[PDB]
From a paper:
We additionally introduced a D614G substitution into the S-R/x3 spike to obtain S-R/x3/D614G. Therefore, we determined the structure of the S-R/x3/D614G spike. The proportion of locked conformations is greatly reduced compared to S-R/x3, constituting only ~19% of total particles. Classification did not identify two different locked conformations of the S-R/x3/D614G –all locked spikes were in the locked-2 conformation. As in the S-R/x3 locked-2 structure, residues 617–641 are ordered, and linoleic acid is bound confirming that the D614G spike retains the ability to bind linoleic acid, a molecule that has been suggested to be important for regulating conformational state of the spike. We suggest that substitution of negatively charged D614 to neutral G alters the local electrostatic interactions, preventing R634 binding between F318 and Y837, and triggering the 617–641 loop refolding. This would provide an explanation for the absence of the locked-1 conformation in S-R/x3/D614G. The absence of the locked-1 conformation with interdigitated domain D in constructs containing the D614G substitution is likely due to the change of electrostatic properties caused by the D614G substitution. Instead, D614G-containing spikes adopt the locked-2 conformation which is more prone to transition away from the locked state towards closed and open conformations. For the D614G spike, based on which all variants of concern were evolved, only the locked-2 conformation was observed.
The spike (S) protein of coronaviruses is responsible for interaction with cellular receptors and fusion with the target cell membrane. The S protein of SARS-CoV-2 is a large, 1273 residue, type I fusion protein, that can be processed by host proteases into two parts, S1 and S2. The spike (S) protein of SARS-CoV-2 has been observed in three distinct pre-fusion conformations: locked, closed and open. To overcome this challenge, based on the locked SARS-CoV-2 S-R/PP structure, we engineered cysteines residues replacing positions D427 and V987 to generate a new disulfide-stabilized S protein S-R/x3.
Numbering used by the authors:
A (entry chain C): 700 to 1140
B (entry chain A): 304 to 676, 689 to 748
C (entry chain A): 945 to 1140
D (entry chain B): 945 to 993
The structure:
């Protein structure tokens, strides 16, 4: 990266005088495809003799089905714990009098039949084969036999994709509830019932939270609002242009589809048998050698299924980790203001907004970034009349002529007074103290 | 694999359907095969000049051979002999010759000796079968037949199914003898002496090797079975050109090349067949369509259930499930009054309810089911929760005046059982071997 | 205590599945080593027993793999429990909904078979009242903002109140602070500020 | 720095176990492909391999 050398000195401080309000998009997978498998059909193409031979294994694919059902239940659990943080389905007021902040892009659009917002619509467009499962209805596999779609081969070999419990509309409704609570009630709708608060005052709370006084909001409200709106516009273009915006989700989709395709391809292996087709074996050999060849094939295909289930358990563990992270982010950044650094964006965290996405969630972290800075001459304390003065909040600063106190993250100089500072002992122990006079009102 | 099922929705294996009928469809050919020419021949060829005969447009009855001919050895590789009636053979060649009795063992894959290296070699990956019978009363005369010759010397062993009828003098020694006989170079072909009185191992044996390959090409030599009709749109035990399987056969649209009869998908199972009689194309599908999930309150509560079929259209459920092949206890669940078409699929056995409750048994796609009391199973779109609309205004604030001190229990697992395994005892029950 | 009982059940079920999987032939003539070793001589006993050994070793490998998955999950839960004990028992956590629904006061641990139980004691504001608010107060041309709390009105007079409890107190110099003139802030109202 | 050295050891041990597991017969006549391919003709070489 760019080599840099900060101009550190023992009495020089860089204080900001201006800021920016950034909006950072960041995307977490939450769930994956609730795959299910019929062991009998996959291993044996509904032939009686192979089924009879598979009968004496029995416990193996009982275990496999148990594992896959656990995975599916875990996926539903993941989605619920991420999105169903609350249960009171709040709705936005008809009036969007939010102090100049424009939420139309993220709030629901009632014109569309589905209540996805604009950004959620873009996100659902960016991921290609999200569903590719339960949507595929029979008859298409018998009507469009010419195309030879992968899903049809998966269905004919017992590999099905179960539908998620929460539909996209229901998840979007949860998201709308979270948004409405965030932008009307502040953080209080997580800690018990939802209160109400004017949005500008909620913003003032957040600014007071990140250690800058509330007044600079009121003094720069319109500007801040404009900045926020512009940031949203930048998101509305940034994820609209490129195609790899939602890579992390599309990769998950691809892994699941690829795994199923590898399984139906692995059906083509001999596994040491005379042929990979049960029908050839059962039409070319009498009972006993058919038993032994079919046993070889059964063991091989059961091994392939066990491999698939093991990889699915690995991937489900990873998705559960990501879903736990998403739940923590929704709890700590949507439902409240997080003091943890770089947990919810690059900069001091103001708020976050959730947006649904296919098999995942998207957080728009709105954050405060100090932008323009000025050098100043500082000193850790002030000696007035033999006693030392230290600031309660802020640091001592000088423009070259006079000294003031300033809050850490914004240049708001104000004259030295008794109430700005406090006194602790004589001024002959502290290093770097300077002389000045302290106004007493 | 237990009686007491608990409350929930379970994915269950497709045992409901059972086949009921068999279909045999063999080509309309009736010419009995030339058994007379390759078995009842006046004279066979010498082993070094073994005679190859194409065979096509046959019906391999081979019960006619039971009447007269008795075969000392009849070994079949790649096919179990009991199945030879249930098959159609594509590229059938008969390789006929005569040897002595002791060398009949050399007509087999992976053998070595005079016959297996210098005269007649079979490949390792040999599909086909070998017949040999003693012929002392035909191919041996007093004084000894010398019409049967074998190649005694060769510089290198033969490749499979390779003939070598050269008669150049074999230079055994290191001095070339320029095309004449004498010392240290011999005439390679030596004549069997088949007296009618010598031992069994020096008695002439006639051998025919039938070489063919199976279930990959248009088969012209068919078995002696009797064809039946074609039952489509119903899952049957089909036997097409010996390819024996079970499934539903339907019409299709594939541009098969003239030299192809079987089509295979990515899984390599056969999917497209060409009917031998009427040169059309058929597609084979399974008759367990796929997911059939069963929804139930757990036993110790009741014994009623519902059934979801994933992805089917509620109109076409009975044909995809093949309800006509099922018992009435299944046909009640195939279709009834309690039809519901979810985007997850078709649900039968529970009445749809326009209300919305926080739900017990999830089904999918926003649908849940529960066993309510009207003591049956209901299905509904699950309720997200209480709709609310906070009364936001730009100068109104809700401040609390009182509080509560709640205590919330929440439970985390920390450890699990420290299991240990002795591999030797588990795998081997303390047996030494 | 479902979450613990499920763990117990998974471990027991896994072991039961293993001893049940001992009953499989794995392509051998029988699933019993004694039958094989009493019906066959050396060489075919070797090959049948090798088939059985490979099958049972595969079953054991499957068991160990599933145990590793489950142990990873338990380690994740144990790391979460350690973090909760550190951040909520040993201290007061500001993270929202980490240690109960509401503002976190404390937590108490309790042991349990193969797990831990946290009693999170938390503060939940219960009864609320509407009020007319304003972000600031213009006294004599300058704007007044509260240090801690928000400006509130019951309809007649204005007070400052801490965020999470209605404790109104009269406007004074020490309750508020001044920043510039009162012609830039939106929503400011007029009132008088007591000076002691 | 045990926690890191253990990771290193696990990776090295895993690779060593793999190259040691190359020495198993797995029910074949021998664990060496060269022995199998020099003692048997095509078909039984196919099945052993
Ligand atoms: C702080 O930064 C903002 C820009 O991020 C400045 O606002 C812009 O100022 C220029 C000229 O004054 C205008 O042309 C722009 O229209 C303003 N941007 C917006 C979004 O309104 C602002 O002037 C800076 N404040 C200080 C004290 O320097
Ligand atoms: C919030 O931002 C949008 C711009 O993205 C403002 O303009 C709307 O843009 C959309 C799509 O371009 C149109 O469907 C709307 O008709 C536009 N609004 C109007 C009044 O025409 C939108 O106005 C902004 N919201 C507010 C309250 O100002
Ligand atoms: C700050 O002010 C005090 C007194 O005004 C200074 O203290 C004197 O410094 C001179 C420097 O030589 C000494 O000669 C005196 O003896 C000191 N008198 C006392 C009472 O301390 C002090 O030096 C000043 N410090 C700075 C950084 O300006
Ligand atoms: C096929 O014909 C070739 C050529 O005659 C044979 O290869 C030669 O065999 C002789 C005797 O072993 C050698 O002296 C030559 O060096 C070989 N020439 C080449 C180019 O290989 C070959 O042995 C014959 N194949 C069979 C199965 O008989
Ligand atoms: C708060 O008080 C000030 C002065 O008492 C008001 O300012 C005057 O408002 C009237 C309204 O028409 C104007 O005619 C005067 O020109 C204003 N004088 C000055 C010095 O500003 C102010 O309007 C009051 N604001 C509220 C919300 O009550
Ligand atoms: C001196 C005795 C032999 C010493 C060498 C021992 C073993 C290796 C040679 C093995 C071949 C044995 C003779 C087989 C002859 C061909 C038989 C046939 O194909 O018809
Ligand atoms: C502060 O001083 C250093 C060196 O004098 C200089 O490099 C730096 O640019 C100054 N900071 C700003 C914001 O100008
Ligand atoms: C520094 O601050 C004082 C305070 O009034 C001001 O008078 C002076 O002009 C300022 N000087 C510079 C260089 O900013
Ligand atoms: C700060 O650094 C300078 C030289 O780099 C030194 O002269 C000065 O004494 C230092 N300030 C203090 C309080 O020590
Ligand atoms: C065979 O021959 C006739 C004429 O090609 C054809 O119509 C018939 O369907 C075929 N099958 C049988 C059993 O005759
Ligand atoms: C073969 O020959 C014998 C007598 O020569 C005769 O009885 C028999 O029917 C013939 N069998 C065949 C298949 O031609
Ligand atoms: C099971 O049956 C017994 C006796 O009827 C009853 O006490 C118990 O509550 C039942 N438990 C469940 C889960 O149904
Ligand atoms: C099949 O499902 C579709 C819904 O997309 C429906 O329009 C159609 O009517 C159904 N087919 C029949 C025969 O009902
Ligand atoms: C349920 O809602 C549908 C659609 O409005 C309607 O057709 C049906 O009559 C309703 N049934 C009941 C019992 O309310
Ligand atoms: C506050 O005002 C709204 C509408 O005037 C009302 O619905 C709500 O009940 C009020 N809040 C309380 C605690 O009464
Ligand atoms: C509002 O607060 C003032 C402060 O004294 C009080 O006098 C008045 O009675 C209160 N009015 C209402 C409606 O609460
Ligand atoms: C608050 O909303 C009302 C109408 O909804 C509006 O008249 C009023 O001007 C708004 N308050 C401010 C400070 O803009």
């Amino acid at each position: 990266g760019a080599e840099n050398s900060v101009a550190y000195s023992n009495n020089s401080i860089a204080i900001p005088t201006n800021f920016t309000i950034s909006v950072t998009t960041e995307i977490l997978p939450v769930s994956m495809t609730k795959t299910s498998v019929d062991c009998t059909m996959y291993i044996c193409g509904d032939s009686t003799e192979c089924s009879n031979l598979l009968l004496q294994y029995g416990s193996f694919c009982t275990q496999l089905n148990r594992a896959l059902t656990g995975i599916a239940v875990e996926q539903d659990k993941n989605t619920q714990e991420v999105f169903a943080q609350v249960k009171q389905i709040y709705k936005t007021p008809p009036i969007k009098d939010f102090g100049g902040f424009n939420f139309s892009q993220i709030l629901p659009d009632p014109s569309k039949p589905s209540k996805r917002s604009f950004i959620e619509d873009l996100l659902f467009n960016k991921v290609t084969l999200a569903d590719a499962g339960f949507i595929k209805q029979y008859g298409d596999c018998l009507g469009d036999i010419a195309a030879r779609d992968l899903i049809c081969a998966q269905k004919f070999n017992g590999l099905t994709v179960l539908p998620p419990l929460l539909t996209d509309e229901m998840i979007a409704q949860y998201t709308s509830a979270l948004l409405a609570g965030t932008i009307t009630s502040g953080w209080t709708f997580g800690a018990g019932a939802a209160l109400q608060i004017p949005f500008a005052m909620q913003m003032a709370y957040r600014f007071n939270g990140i250690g800058v006084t509330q007044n600079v909001l009121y003094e720069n409200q319109k500007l801040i609002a404009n900045q926020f709106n512009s940031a949203i516009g930048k998101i509305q273009d940034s994820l609209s242009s490129t195609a790899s915006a939602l890579g992390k989700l599309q990769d998950v989709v691809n892994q699941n589809a690829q795994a199923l395709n590898t399984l139906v391809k692995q059906l083509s292996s001999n596994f040491g048998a005379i042929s990979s087709v049960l029908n050839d074996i059962l039409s070319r050999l009498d009972k006993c050698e058919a038993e032994v060849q079919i046993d070889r094939l059964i063991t091989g295909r059961l091994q392939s299924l066990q491999t698939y289930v093991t990889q699915q358990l690995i991937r489900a563990a990873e998705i559960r980790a990501s879903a736990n992270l998403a739940a923590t982010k929704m709890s700590e950044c949507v439902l409240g203001q997080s003091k943890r650094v770089d947990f919810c964006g690059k900069g001091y965290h103001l708020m976050s907004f959730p947006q649904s996405a296919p098999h995942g969630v998207v957080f728009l972290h709105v954050t405060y970034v100090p932008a323009q800075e000025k050098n100043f001459t500082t000193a850790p304390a002030i000696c007035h009349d033999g006693k030392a003065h230290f600031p309660r909040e802020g640091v001592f600063v000088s423009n070259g002529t006079h000294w003031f106190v300033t809050q850490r993250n914004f240049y708001e100089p104000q004259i030295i007074t008794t109430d700005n500072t406090f006194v602790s002992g004589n001024c002959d122990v502290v290093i770097g103290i300077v002389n000045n006079t302290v106004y007493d009102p | 694999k237990s009686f007491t099922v608990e409350k929930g929705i379970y994915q269950t294996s497709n045992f409901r359907v059972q086949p009921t009928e068999s279909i045999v469809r063999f080509p309309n050919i009736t010419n009995l095969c030339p058994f007379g020419e390759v078995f009842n021949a006046t004279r066979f060829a010498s082993v070094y000049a073994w005679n190859r005969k194409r065979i096509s447009n046959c019906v391999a009855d081979y019960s006619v051979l039971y009447n007269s001919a008795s075969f000392s050895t009849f070994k079949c590789y790649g096919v179990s002999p009991t199945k030879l009636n249930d098959l159609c053979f594509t590229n059938v060649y008969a390789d006929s010759f005569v040897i002595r009795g002791d060398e009949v063992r050399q007509i087999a894959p992976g053998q070595t000796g005079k016959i297996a290296d210098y005269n007649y070699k079979l490949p390792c990956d040999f599909t086909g079968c070998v017949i040999a019978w003693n012929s002392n009363n035909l191919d041996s005369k007093v004084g000894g037949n010398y019409n049967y010759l074998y190649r005694l010397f060769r510089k290198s062993n033969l490749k499979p199914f390779e003939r070598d009828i050269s008669t150049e003098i074999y230079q055994a020694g290191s001095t070339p003898c320029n095309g004449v006989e004498g010392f240290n170079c011999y005439f390679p072909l030596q004549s069997y002496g088949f007296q009618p009185t010598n031992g069994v191992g020096y008695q002439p044996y006639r051998v025919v090797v039938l070489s063919f390959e199976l279930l990959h090409a248009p088969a012209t030599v068919c078995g002696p079975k009797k064809s039946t009709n074609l039952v489509k749109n119903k899952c049957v035990n089909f036997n097409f050109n010996g390819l024996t399987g079970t499934g539903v056969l339907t019409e299709s649209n594939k541009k098969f090349l003239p030299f192809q009869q079987f089509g295979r998908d990515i899984a390599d199972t056969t999917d497209a067949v060409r009917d031998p009689q009427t040169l059309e194309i058929l597609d084979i599908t399974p008759c367990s369509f796929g997911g059939v999930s069963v929804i139930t309150p757990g036993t110790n509560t009741s014994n009623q259930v519902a059934v979801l079929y994933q992805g089917v259209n509620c109109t076409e459920v009975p044909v995809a499930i093949h309800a006509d092949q099922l018992t009435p206890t299944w046909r009640v669940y195939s279709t009834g009054s309690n039809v519901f078409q979810t985007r997850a699929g078709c649900l039968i056995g529970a009445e749809h309810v326009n209300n919305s409750y926080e739900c017990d048994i999830p089904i999918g796609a926003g649908i849940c089911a529960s066993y309510q009391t009207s003591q049956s199973i209901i299905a509904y779109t699950m309720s997200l929760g209480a709709e609310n609309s906070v009364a936001y205004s730009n100068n109104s604030i809700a401040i609390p005046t009182n509080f509560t001190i709640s205590v919330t229990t929440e439970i985390l697992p920390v450890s699990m059982t420290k299991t240990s395994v002795d591999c030797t005892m588990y795998i081997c029950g303390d047996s030494t071997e």
